[PDB]
Amino acid sequence: SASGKWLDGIRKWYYNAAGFNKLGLLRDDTMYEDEDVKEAIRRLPDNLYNDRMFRIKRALDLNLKHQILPKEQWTKYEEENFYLEPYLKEVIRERKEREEWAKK
Amino acid sequence: AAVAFTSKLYSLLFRRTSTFALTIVVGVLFFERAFDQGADAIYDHINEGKLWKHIK
Amino acid sequence: FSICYADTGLLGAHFVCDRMKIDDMMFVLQGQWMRLCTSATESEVARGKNILRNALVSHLDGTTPVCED
Amino acid sequence: MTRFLGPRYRQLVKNWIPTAYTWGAVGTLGLAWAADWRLILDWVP
Amino acid sequence: MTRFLGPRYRQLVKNWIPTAYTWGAVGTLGLAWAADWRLILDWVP
Amino acid sequence: TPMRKSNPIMKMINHSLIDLPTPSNISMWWNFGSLLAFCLILQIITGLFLAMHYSPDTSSAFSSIAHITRDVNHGWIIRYLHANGASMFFICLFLHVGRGLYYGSFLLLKTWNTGIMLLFLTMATAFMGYVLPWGQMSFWGATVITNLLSAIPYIGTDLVQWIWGGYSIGNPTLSRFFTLHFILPFIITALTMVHLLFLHETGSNNPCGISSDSDKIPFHPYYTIKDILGLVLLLFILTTLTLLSPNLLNDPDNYIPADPLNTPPHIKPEWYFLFAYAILRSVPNKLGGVLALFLSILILSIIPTLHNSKQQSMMFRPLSQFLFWFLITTLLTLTWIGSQPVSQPFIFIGQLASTMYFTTVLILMPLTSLIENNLLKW
Numbered sequence: 001s002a003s004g005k006w007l008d009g010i011r012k013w014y015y016n017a018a019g020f021n022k023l024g025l026l027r028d029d030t031m032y033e034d035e036d037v038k039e040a041i042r043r044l045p046d047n048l049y050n051d052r053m054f055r056i057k058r059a060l061d062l063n064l065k066h067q068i069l070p071k072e073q074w075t076k077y078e079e080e081n082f083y084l085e086p087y088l089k090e091v092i093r094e095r096k097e098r099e100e101w102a103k104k
Numbered sequence: 105a106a107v108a109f110t111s112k113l114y115s116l117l118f119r120r121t122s123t124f125a126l127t128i129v130v131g132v133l134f135f136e137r138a139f140d141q142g143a144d145a146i147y148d149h150i151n152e153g154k155l156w157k158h159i160k
Numbered sequence: 161f162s163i164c165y166a167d168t169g170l171l172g173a174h175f176v177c178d179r180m181k182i183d184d185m186m187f188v189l190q191g192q193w194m195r196l197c198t199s200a201t202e203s204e205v206a207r208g209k210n211i212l213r214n215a216l217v218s219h220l221d222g223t224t225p226v227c228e229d
Numbered sequence: 230m231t232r233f234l235g236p237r238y239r240q241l242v243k244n245w246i247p248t249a250y251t252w253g254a255v256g257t258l259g260l261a262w263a264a265d266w267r268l269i270l271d272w273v274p
Numbered sequence: 275m276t277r278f279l280g281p282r283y284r285q286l287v288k289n290w291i292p293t294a295y296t297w298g299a300v301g302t303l304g305l306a307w308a309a310d311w312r313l314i315l316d317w318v319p
Numbered sequence: 320t321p322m323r324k325s326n327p328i329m330k331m332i333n334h335s336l337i338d339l340p341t342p343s344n345i346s347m348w349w350n351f352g353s354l355l356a357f358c359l360i361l362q363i364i365t366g367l368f369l370a371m372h373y374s375p376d377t378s379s380a381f382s383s384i385a386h387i388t389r390d391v392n393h394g395w396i397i398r399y400l401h402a403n404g405a406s407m408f409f410i411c412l413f414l415h416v417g418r419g420l421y422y423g424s425f426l427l428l429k430t431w432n433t434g435i436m437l438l439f440l441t442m443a444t445a446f447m448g449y450v451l452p453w454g455q456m457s458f459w460g461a462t463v464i465t466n467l468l469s470a471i472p473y474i475g476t477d478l479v480q481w482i483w484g485g486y487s488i489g490n491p492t493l494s495r496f497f498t499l500h501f502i503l504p505f506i507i508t509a510l511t512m513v514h515l516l517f518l519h520e521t522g523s524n525n526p527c528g529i530s531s532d533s534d535k536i537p538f539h540p541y542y543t544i545k546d547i548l549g550l551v552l553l554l555f556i557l558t559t560l561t562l563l564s565p566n567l568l569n570d571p572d573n574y575i576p577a578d579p580l581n582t583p584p585h586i587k588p589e590w591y592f593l594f595a596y597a598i599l600r601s602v603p604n605k606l607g608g609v610l611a612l613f614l615s616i617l618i619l620s621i622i623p624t625l626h627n628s629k630q631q632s633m634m635f636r637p638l639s640q641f642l643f644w645f646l647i648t649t650l651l652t653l654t655w656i657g658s659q660p661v662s663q664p665f666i667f668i669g670q671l672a673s674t675m676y677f678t679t680v681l682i683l684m685p686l687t688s689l690i691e692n693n694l695l696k697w
C-alpha cells in the first residue's frame with residue numbers, strides 16, 4: 001500500500017535536513033561510541049575500518065574550515081551502506097544472553 | 105641585492121631575542137608620552153571653556 | 161647529511177625511532193643545532209677537523225673512486 | 230667546586246657576555262620605566 | 275531496567291534483608307541519641 | 320628528556336596546558352571556561368582590596384562604601400570593576416552551561432556534577448555579596464532569603480532564628496554574611512581544580528559529537544593564542560562597561576540606606592536572579608514555591624538519565640534544535656516576568672512559562688529523541 005511511499009518520503013526529508021551527507025559521512029559513522037558500538041567497531045575488517053577512519057578525519061577537517069563538500073559529492077539517501085548494523089546486532093544479542101543467564 | 109627596510113629591521117634588531125626585548129622597552133618609553141599628550145590635547149579641545157583649569 | 165646541487169642544496173639529518181621516542185629525539189637534535197650556533201668551542205672543532213681530514217683521505221683508495229672524483 | 234676552572238669554561242663565558250649585558254640593559258630600562266624613576270628618566274630627551 | 279526481575283535477584287535481596295534492618299536500627303537510635311530526640315528517648319527506662 | 324618532563328609539578332603543568340591533546344575543530348563556545356577562571360581571579364583581587372576599607376557593621380557599612388568611592392584614590396573604579404565583573408561572571412556561566420546542553424557534553428558525568436556544585440556555590444557567593452552595602456534593597460533581600468528555611472516543616476523557624484543570631488535581622492547577621500562571602504571563593508577555586516582534573520582524564524567533546532582521536536593537536540600554541548584573543552575581547556567589553564556606561568545595570572533603590580520599617584512598593588533583585596524570582600512568584604503555596612525554586616536548578620542532574628538519542632550532539636538533529644531554542648525563550652520570558660509587578664497578566668504568563676520549562680526538560684525532549692531515532696531507522 002501507499003503508506004510505504006509516504007513514510008519513505010518523510011524519512012528522506014529528515015535525512016536531508018540532518019546534513020551529515022554534506023560532510024561526506026554515512027549514518028553509521030555518526031553513532032556515539034558506547035560500549036557495544038566500540039565492540040562492533042573492533043570486529044570490522046580492515047578495509048571498512050580504514051575507510052571509516054579517513055571519512056571521519058575528513059569531516060573533522062571540513063568542520064575546522066567551516067566548509068562543506070561540493071553538492072556533487074554529498075551522500076545520497078538511496079545508495080547508502082549501513083555497514084555497522086549487522087555487527088552491532090550480534091554484540092547486543094550476546095549481551096542479552098548473558099543478562100538472561102544472570103537472573104536464574 | 106635590494107637593501108630593503110624590513111630586512112634591515114630584521115637583521116639589526118629582531119634577529120636576537122635580547123635586542124628584540126630592548127627594542128620593545130625603548131619603543132614603549134616614547135609611545136607612552138606621545139600618546140598621552142595627543143589624547144589630552146583632543147580632550148581639552150572637545151570641551152574648551154568648561155574646565156576649571158582655564159577658568160582658574 | 162649535506163646534499164649539494166648547482167645553485168642549492170639540502171642540509172639536515174635523518175633518523176629512525178620507536179614511536180614513543182620521536183619527540184625527545186627531535187628536541188635533542190635541534191638543541192645541538194642551537195648549541196653550535198651560539199656556544200661552540202675550539203676543543204670540539206679540532207676533533208671535527210681531524211675527522212674530516214680522515215674521511216677525505218680514506219675515500220680516495222683504489223682507481224674507481226679516483227676516476228669518479 | 231674547583232671543577233669549573235679551565236679553558237673551556239673561559240671560552241664559554243666569553244661566548245655569553247654580550248647577551249648578558251643586553252639583558253642587563255633591558256632590565257634596568259624596564260625597572261626605570263615602570264617606577265617612573267626620575268634619576269634615570271630625567272636624562273632621556 | 276527490566277533486567278533485575280528474576281529468581282537470583284530475589285534470593286540475593288533475601289540474603290541481605292537482616293543486615294539492612296540492623297543498620298536501620300543503628301541509624302535510628304544514633305540520630306535520636308545525637309539530637310536528644312525526646313519522642314524516642316522518653317520511652318527508654 | 321627536556322625539563323618540561325623532568326619533575327612532577329612541571330609534568331603536571333605539561334599534561335595540563337602544553338602537550339595536552341585537544342580537538343582541532345572546537346569553536347568559540349569553548350572559550351568561556353577560561354573566561355570564567357579569569358573572572359574568578361579578577362573578583363578575588365578586587366575583593367581583597369575593597370575588604371581593607373569596608374566595615375561589617377550596620378551603623379557604618381553604607382558610609383564605608385561612600386568613603387571608598389569618594390576619598391580613596393581610584394577607589395571608585397575598583398568598586399565599578401568588582402560590580403561589573405560579577406555580571407560578566409554570570410553571563411559567561413549561563414553561556415557555558417548552554418553549550419553543554421546543546422552539544423551533549425553532560426555525558427561526562429563527573430565534570431557535569433562538579434559543574435552543578437560550582438553553579439550553586441557561585442550563586443550563594445554572589446547573593447551574600449549583594450547584601451553588604453546595607454541599602455534598602457539589600458536589607459529586604461537578606462530578609463527573604465533567610466526566611467526561606469521557615470518552609471522546612473519541623474525545624475524551620477528555629478533554623479531561621481539560629482542563622483539570625485537573634486529575634487530579627489541585625490548586626491549579628493551582617494558579620495556572618497561577610498565571613499561567608501570572604502571564605503567561599505577559595506572553596507570555589509579548589510573545586511575548579513578538581514573539575515579540571517576530572518576533565519583531563521577524557522578530554523574535550525566537540526561540535527560533531529564523534530571521536531576526535533584521529534585529529535588531535537597540542538594545546539600550545541593554538542589554543543593559548545585563541546584564549547588570549549578571547550581575554551582581550553572580554554577586557555574591551557568590561558572597560559567599556561566600567562568607564563563609558565557604568566550606570567547601565569545600576570539600581571537606584573540601593574542608594575537609599577536601610578529602613579527596617581518600610582518595604583518599597585516595587586521590588587526587583589539583581590538581574591541574574593530574576594528568573595528564579597519569577598518561578599518563586601508563580602506557585603500559590605509556600606512550601607511548593609520553595610520546592611520549585613530549588614528544583615529549577617537541581618533538575619540538571621537528571622538530564623544524563625533522560626538521554627535517548629543514538630547521537631551525542633544536536634548538530635545533526637533539527638527537531639531537537641527547535642526545542643532547544645524554545646526552552647531558551649521560556650527562560651527569557653521568566654526573566655521578563657520577574658521585572659514586572661505582581662499583577663494579573665504577568666501572573667498568568669509566568670505560570671505558563673514555568674510549566675512549559677519543566678514540561679520541556681522532562682517530557683518533550685525525550686519523546687522527540689525517540690521520534691528522531693525512528694526516522695533514521697534504528
Ligand SMILES: CCCCCCCCCCCCCCCCCC(=O)OC[C@H](COP(=O)([O-])OCC(O)COP(=O)([O-])OC[C@@H](COC(=O)CCCCCCCCCCCCCCCCC)OC(=O)CCCCCCCCCCCCCCCCC)OC(=O)CCCCCCCCCCCCCCCCC
Nearest residue numbers: 066345346347348526548552555556557559560563564567
Ligand atoms: C556605547 C557603547 C559602544 C560599544 C561598542 C561595542 C563594539 C564591539 C565590537 C566587537 C568586535 C568583535 C570582533 C570579533 C572577531 C572574532 C573573529 C572570529 O574568529 O570570530 C569567530 C566567531 C564565530 O565563531 P565560530 O567558530 O563560527 O562558532 C560560532 C558558531 O558555532 C557558528 O555556527 P553557525 O556557523 O551555524 O552560525 C552562523 C550564523 C547563525 O545565524 C543565525 O543563527 C541566524 C541569524 C539571523 C539574524 C537575522 C537578523 C536579525 C533577526 C531578524 C528576524 C526578523 C524579524 C521580524 C520581526 C517582525 C515583527 C512583526 O552565525 C553567525 O554567522 C554569527 C556572526 C555574527 C556574530 C555577532 C556577534 C555580536 C557581538 C555583540 C557584542 C555586544 C556587546 C558589546 C559591548 C557593549 C557595551 C555597552 O565570530 C565570527 O565569526 C564573527 C566575527 C565578527 C563579529 C562582529 C561583531 C560586531 C558587534 C558590534 C556591536 C555594536 C553594538 C553594541 C550595542 C551594545 C548595547 C548595550
Ligand SMILES: CCCCCCCCCCCCCCCCCC(=O)OC[C@H](COP(=O)([O-])OCC[N+](C)(C)C)OC(=O)CCCCCCCCCCCCCCCCC
Nearest residue numbers: 118119120121124125126128129255256258259260263264
Ligand atoms: C617589579 C615591577 C617592575 C617590573 C618591570 C619590568 C621591566 C621589564 C619589562 C620588559 C617588557 C618587554 C619584554 C619582552 C620579552 C619578549 C620575549 C619573547 O619571547 O618575545 C617573543 C615572543 C614570541 O614571539 P614570536 O614567537 O612571534 O617570535 C619570536 C622570535 N624571535 C625572538 C626570533 C623574534 O613574543 C611574545 O609573545 C612576548 C610577549 C610578552 C608580553 C609582555 C607584556 C608586558 C609585561 C611587562 C610590562 C608591565 C610591567 C608593569 C610594572 C608595574 C610596576 C608598578
Ligand SMILES: CCCCCCCCCCCCCCCCCC(=O)OC[C@H](COP(=O)([O-])OCC[N+](C)(C)C)OC(=O)CCCCCCCCCCCCCCCCC
Nearest residue numbers: 296297298299300301302303304305306307308309310311
Ligand atoms: C549529623 C549529626 C548527628 C550524627 C549522629 C551520628 C549517629 C551515629 C553514631 C554512631 C557511633 C558508633 C559507630 C560505630 C561504628 C563502628 C564500625 C567499625 O568499623 O567498628 C570497628 C572498628 C575496628 O575494630 P577492630 O578492627 O578492632 O575489629 C572490628 C571487627 N568486628 C566488627 C568483627 C568486631 O573500630 C573502630 O576503630 C571504630 C571507631 C569509630 C569511632 C567513632 C567516634 C564517634 C563519632 C560519632 C559520635 C559523635 C557524633 C556527634 C554529633 C553531634 C551533633 C550535634
Ligand SMILES: CCCCCCCC/C=C/CCCCCCCC(=O)OC[C@H](COP(=O)(O)OCCN)OC(=O)CCCCCCC/C=C/CCCCCCCC
Nearest residue numbers: 187188190191192252253254255256257260320321322323
Ligand atoms: C640590576 C637591575 C636588574 C637586572 C636584571 C637582569 C636580568 C634581566 C632578565 C633576564 C631574563 C633571563 C634570560 C636568560 C635566561 C637563561 C635561562 C637558562 O640558561 O636556562 C635554560 C635552561 C632550559 O632547560 P633545558 O630545556 O633542560 O635546556 C636544555 C637545552 N638543550 O634551564 C632552565 O631550565 C631554565 C633556568 C632558568 C634560570 C633563570 C634565572 C633567572 C635569574 C634572574 C636574576 C634577576 C636579578 C634581579 C636583581 C634585582 C636587583 C637586586
Ligand SMILES: CCCCCCCC/C=C/CCCCCCCC(=O)OC[C@H](COP(=O)(O)OCCN)OC(=O)CCCCCCC/C=C/CCCCCCCC
Nearest residue numbers: 348410413414416417418420421526590619633634647650
Ligand atoms: C546583561 C543582560 C544579559 C542577558 C542574558 C545573556 C545570556 C543569554 C543570551 C541569549 C541569546 C544567545 C544567542 C547566541 C547566538 C545564537 C546563534 C545561533 O543561533 O547559531 C546557531 C548555531 C548552529 O550551529 P550548529 O548546530 O553547531 O551547526 C553549524 C555547523 N554546521 O550555533 C548553535 O546552535 C550553537 C548553540 C550553543 C549554545 C548557545 C546557548 C545560548 C544561550 C545560553 C544561555 C541561556 C540561559 C541558560 C540556559 C541553561 C539553563 C539551565
Ligand code: HEM
Nearest residue numbers: 349351352353355356419424430431434435437438523524
Ligand atoms: C566557576 C565556575 C566554572 C569554571 C571556572 C569552569 C571552568 C571550566 C573550564 C576552564 C573548562 C575547559 C573547557 C571549556 O572552557 O569549555 C570547563 C569545561 C567544562 N565545564 Fe566547567 N567551569 C565552571 C562551571 C561549570 C558549570 C556550572 C558546568 C555545568 C553545569 C560546567 C561543566 C563543564 C563541562 C561539562 C565541561 C567540559 C565540556 C566539554 O569539554 O565539552 N562547568 N570548565
Ligand code: HEM
Nearest residue numbers: 362363366367369370373402405445448449451452501504
Ligand atoms: C566569585 C567571587 C566573588 C563574587 C561573585 C563577588 C560578588 C560580589 C558582589 C555582587 C558584591 C556587591 C556589589 C555591589 O554592592 O555593588 C560584592 C561586594 C563585596 N565583595 Fe565580592 N565577590 C567575590 C569575591 C570576593 C572576595 C574574594 C572578597 C574578599 C574579601 C570580596 C569582598 C567583597 C567586599 C568587601 C564587598 C563589599 C564592597 C562593595 O559592596 O563594594 N569579594 N561582591
Ligand SMILES: O=C1C(=C2CCC(c3ccc(Cl)cc3)CC2)C(O)=C(O)c2ccccc21
Nearest residue numbers: 335336341349352353356357515523542546
Ligand atoms: O582553557 C582551557 C583550559 C585551561 C587553560 C588554562 C587556564 C588558566 C587559568 C588561570 C591560570 Cl592562573 C592559569 C591557567 C584554565 C583553563 C583547560 O584546562 C582545557 O582542558 C581546555 C580545553 C579546551 C579549550 C580550552 C581549555
Ligand SMILES: O=C1C(O)=C([C@H]2CC[C@H](c3ccc(Cl)cc3)CC2)C(=O)c2ccccc21
Nearest residue numbers: 442456459460463464586587588592595596
Ligand atoms: O522578594 C525578593 C526575593 O524573592 C528574592 C529572591 C530571588 C531569588 C533568590 C534565589 C535563591 C536561590 C537560588 Cl538557587 C537562586 C535565587 C532568593 C531571593 C530577592 O532576591 C529579593 C531581593 C530584594 C528584595 C526582595 C527580594
